[PDB]
Amino acid sequence: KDYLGRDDIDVSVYEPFTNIFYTNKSHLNGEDHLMGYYYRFAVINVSIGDYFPVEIIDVINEFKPAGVTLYVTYDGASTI
Amino acid sequence: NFKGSPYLDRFDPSKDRTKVLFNPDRPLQQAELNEMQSIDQYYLKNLGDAIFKDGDKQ
Amino acid sequence: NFKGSPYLDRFDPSKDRTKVLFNPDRPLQQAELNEMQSIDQYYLKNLGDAIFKDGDKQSGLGFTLSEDNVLTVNPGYVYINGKIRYYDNDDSVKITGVGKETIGIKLTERIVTPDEDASLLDQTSGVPSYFSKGADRLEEKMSLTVNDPTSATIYTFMDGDLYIQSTNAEMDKINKVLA
Amino acid sequence: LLDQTSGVPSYFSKGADRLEEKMSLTVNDPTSATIYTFMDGDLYIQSTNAEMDKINKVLA
Amino acid sequence: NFKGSPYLDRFDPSKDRTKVLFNPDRPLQQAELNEMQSIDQYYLKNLGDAIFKDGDKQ
Amino acid sequence: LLDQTSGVPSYFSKGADRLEEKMSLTVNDPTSATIYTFMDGDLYIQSTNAEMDKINKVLA
Amino acid sequence: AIATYNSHVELAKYLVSKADSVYLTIGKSTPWSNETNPPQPDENATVLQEVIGYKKATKVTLVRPSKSPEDDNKNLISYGNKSWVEVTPENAKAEGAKWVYLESSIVGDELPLGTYRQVGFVMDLVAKSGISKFNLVPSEVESTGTLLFFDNKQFQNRSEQTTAKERFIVEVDPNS
Amino acid sequence: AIATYNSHVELAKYLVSKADSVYLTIGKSTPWSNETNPPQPDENATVLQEVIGYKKATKVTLVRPSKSPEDDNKNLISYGNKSWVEVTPENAKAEGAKWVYLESSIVGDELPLGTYRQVGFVMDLVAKSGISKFNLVPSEVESTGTLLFFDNKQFQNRSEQTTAKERFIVEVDPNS
Numbered sequence: 001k002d003y004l005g006r007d008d009i010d011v012s013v014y015e016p017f018t019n020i021f022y023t024n025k026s027h028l029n030g031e032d033h034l035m036g037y038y039y040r041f042a043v044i045n046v047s048i049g050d051y052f053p054v055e056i057i058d059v060i061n062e063f064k065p066a067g068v069t070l071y072v073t074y075d076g077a078s079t080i
Numbered sequence: 081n082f083k084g085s086p087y088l089d090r091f092d093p094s095k096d097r098t099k100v101l102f103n104p105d106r107p108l109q110q111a112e113l114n115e116m117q118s119i120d121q122y123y124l125k126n127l128g129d130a131i132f133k134d135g136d137k138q
Numbered sequence: 139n140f141k142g143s144p145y146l147d148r149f150d151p152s153k154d155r156t157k158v159l160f161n162p163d164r165p166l167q168q169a170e171l172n173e174m175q176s177i178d179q180y181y182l183k184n185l186g187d188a189i190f191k192d193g194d195k196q197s198g199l200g201f202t203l204s205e206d207n208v209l210t211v212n213p214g215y216v217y218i219n220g221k222i223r224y225y226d227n228d229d230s231v232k233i234t235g236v237g238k239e240t241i242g243i244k245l246t247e248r249i250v251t252p253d254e255d256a257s258l259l260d261q262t263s264g265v266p267s268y269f270s271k272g273a274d275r276l277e278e279k280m281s282l283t284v285n286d287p288t289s290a291t292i293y294t295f296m297d298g299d300l301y302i303q304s305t306n307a308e309m310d311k312i313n314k315v316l317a
Numbered sequence: 318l319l320d321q322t323s324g325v326p327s328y329f330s331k332g333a334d335r336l337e338e339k340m341s342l343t344v345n346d347p348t349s350a351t352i353y354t355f356m357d358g359d360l361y362i363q364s365t366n367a368e369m370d371k372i373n374k375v376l377a
Numbered sequence: 378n379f380k381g382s383p384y385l386d387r388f389d390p391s392k393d394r395t396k397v398l399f400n401p402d403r404p405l406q407q408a409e410l411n412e413m414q415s416i417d418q419y420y421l422k423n424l425g426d427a428i429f430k431d432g433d434k435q
Numbered sequence: 436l437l438d439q440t441s442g443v444p445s446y447f448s449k450g451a452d453r454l455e456e457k458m459s460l461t462v463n464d465p466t467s468a469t470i471y472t473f474m475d476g477d478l479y480i481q482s483t484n485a486e487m488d489k490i491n492k493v494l495a
Numbered sequence: 496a497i498a499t500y501n502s503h504v505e506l507a508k509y510l511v512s513k514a515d516s517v518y519l520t521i522g523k524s525t526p527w528s529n530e531t532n533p534p535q536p537d538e539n540a541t542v543l544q545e546v547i548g549y550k551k552a553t554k555v556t557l558v559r560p561s562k563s564p565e566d567d568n569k570n571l572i573s574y575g576n577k578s579w580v581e582v583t584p585e586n587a588k589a590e591g592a593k594w595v596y597l598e599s600s601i602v603g604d605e606l607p608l609g610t611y612r613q614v615g616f617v618m619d620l621v622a623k624s625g626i627s628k629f630n631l632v633p634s635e636v637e638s639t640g641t642l643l644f645f646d647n648k649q650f651q652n653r654s655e656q657t658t659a660k661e662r663f664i665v666e667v668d669p670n671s
Numbered sequence: 672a673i674a675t676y677n678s679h680v681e682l683a684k685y686l687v688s689k690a691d692s693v694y695l696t697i698g699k700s701t702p703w704s705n706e707t708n709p710p711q712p713d714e715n716a717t718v719l720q721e722v723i724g725y726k727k728a729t730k731v732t733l734v735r736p737s738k739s740p741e742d743d744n745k746n747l748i749s750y751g752n753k754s755w756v757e758v759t760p761e762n763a764k765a766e767g768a769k770w771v772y773l774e775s776s777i778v779g780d781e782l783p784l785g786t787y788r789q790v791g792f793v794m795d796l797v798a799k800s801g802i803s804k805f806n807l808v809p810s811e812v813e814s815t816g817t818l819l820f821f822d823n824k825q826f827q828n829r830s831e832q833t834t835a836k837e838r839f840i841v842e843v844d845p846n847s
Binding site for chain 6: 164312
């Protein structure tokens with residue numbers, strides 16, 4: 001929000017390890033997925049509701065903790 | 081018949097499919113589990129029928 | 139080979155492990171599921187091998203030979219590679235018509251994915267995993283091959299004449315004891 | 318059938334059903350698998366040991 | 378003793394239950410998974426015992 | 436037996452156990468499945484080919 | 496005569512039934528006239544300019560705007576600065592669902608890397624024999640089918656670490 | 672975020688592909704509050720009021736407005752006191768044929784005799800098992816299918832000699 005212009009944009013961080021398929025609790029045809037490469041701890045996917053230079057990725061590299069893989073998701077539905 | 085909505089058992093002998101190979105980072109389908117045992121039971125039935133007949137006392 | 143990255147099947151006969159014991163509140167592994175079906179199929183193959191032979195005909199499979207040395211086989215049951223499979227393919231093959239010739243069935247493994255067959259996509263209506271990709275399928279189809287040593291022989295011809303008959307089901311191990 | 322594993326989130330939650338196949342005895346039912354045949358209240362055929370039709374054809 | 382606390386396998390031959398029919402949007406009990414293979418192994422054992430005896434060399 | 440996708444010990448690495456059934460040779464244990472019988476160090480009965488108790492009972 | 500509310504619903508159910516032939520397509524890999532003010536689109540234009548490729552739709556479904564409390568515990572979709580929820584084809588008329596949600600994640604280099612400025616959705620796309628894969632370059636396509644909807648945007652760029660999640664909510668009439 | 676001009680034509684091709692299942696239907700057999708001034712037809716309504724019955728569609732086709740000199744020398748329709756040309760499905764996008772024509776004739780007493788004030792067209796009508804005749808009263812219908820289009824009318828009437836003929840030209844998006 002301090003590299004883009006403003007605060008009112010939608011920005012959230014997704015943590016896929018919360019949707020790891022456990023034997024008991026996870027629903028069979030639910031939202032959870034089988035553990036693997038993407039559904040894994042030390043992984044985050046950041047959804048950004050506006051246009052950006054590629055270099056914002058490097059800004060997140062300055063802030064994110066060491067050892068965590070980063071993916072960045074542009075959401076088209078905000079810009080229309 | 082388990083092919084209907086509440087179970088969706090997708091096994092079919094005509095398709096000659098013999099193994100449900102699961103992949104990582106995918107959701108788990110109840111139909112896959114049902115087919116997983118349906119294949120083994122069907123081939124066990126075939127093995128038995130090749131030897132015995134229905135009503136054969138042992 | 140199912141030991142590779144996409145499936146990571148951990149089954150191995152030499153380890154003498156016959157049951158996967160799941161535990162509660164743990165992350166489920168697809169490799170455990172693959173091994174779970176692998177074990178049962180391996181032991182079913184062993185039980186079949188203890189009785190049958192890969193070229194043993196159980197019923198049907200009556201052949202038809204035209205005047206032009208074209209050959210076709212009717213549907214029927216046969217034991218090939220640990221399982222009794224129902225042959226239902228309409229092959230035409232042509233033999234040379236001279237010397238010794240053997241007709242066999244070859245089993246080809248192939249992988250069926252959602253990418254090829256859309257029906258494998260989840261169709262459980264009104265739930266979050268609807269239309270989502272899932273498990274693949276192993277398709278094993280049977281076809282005729284002539285003078286192929288890798289295939290399991292079902293018939294043998296000399297100069298286009300049938301060499302040996304078998305009216306009823308073939309059972310190699312039983313036949314050895316009976317002989 | 319409800320989950321009876323103590324201290325889990327899915328405790329007492331519904332799960333998979335079970336296919337129950339109960340065998341029952343019947344008289345002159347053509348769908349059933351015949352085990353015995355009687356004539357006028359007398360046993361028609363005996364079998365002192367296991368029956369194996371496919372084996373029996375080869376042996377015959 | 379697979380009826381014990383860690384696994385809770387519900388298999389018992391007297392119940393004459395041959396298949397586990399999974400349903401969507403429910404927990405996947407580990408006990409169900411254990412029973413799924415126990416049923417198949419038990420029936421394979423029956424099929425083997427109908428032909429062979431313990432210690433029969435092949 | 437840990438998770439192969441991660442390949443390192445972790446909170447999520449542990450999963451299902453395995454039942455191992457190793458075979459061992461005995462001398463006179465009655466509970467074990469007999470395969471051979473000896474009398475004064477001499478073989479008692481031979482079997483050139485596969486043994487099938489139920490089949491042999493039918494054939495006898 | 497008037498068009499009933501259910502007509503829009505049924506024509507939406509038709510484009511949902513075509514899902515197996517729906518492909519995202521992206522194009523215009525060289526500049527506009529002005530890269531800061533893309534031209535208005537042309538409704539007659541039959542295919543994208545400078546076509547980069549085609550990718551199968553990851554999702555095609557009916558939706559409706561979400562409402563509380565009856566949608567409070569369901570799979571809500573954020574789009575258009577609003578909130579939406581999925582509806583199944585056999586409930587369409589009862590729910591009043593006349594809007595279709597369309598999506599496809601282009602991941603990494605599974606289509607050629609480079610800038611793009613045009614995006615749209617085709618149906619009745621057909622590839623050449625034995626090309627089973629969901630991702631196609633224009634030479635692997637046998638028929639491009641019909642272009643239903645498209646738009647012009649300021650330029651984007653891509654790399655192996657990027658994903659483009661192009662999507663829409665529409666009806667063939669977008670503005671009832 | 673526009674639609675292409677082809678897109679409307681495809682929905683029209685879909686509507687013409689349904690033709691075998693399409694039936695004229697007629698209703699509102701008792702008076703309005705004023706027979707010379709009908710109320711507004713509600714687009715939420717599922718079926719006509721006071722249904723008289725159904726008759727199979729006698730002609731369904733794509734159509735467009737005529738242009739001289741070429742269409743003056745082709746197959747032709749006069750309606751609205753003005754001239755139209757018929758279009759075949761395999762030319763629809765080349766012609767731009769986004770209008771669907773629907774027509775049927777109700778002859779004598781093949782449906783019950785009476786006055787009427789509503790006219791419309793249904794698809795996917797299924798008669799009860801064993802019925803095959805093209806004229807149906809409501810008790811002969813197993814599924815009424817779907818009413819796509821209708822209008823309210825000033826009061827009208829029929830007798831044993833007469834044929835009542837009604838026909839519509841419609842389009843899928845009057846509001847681009």
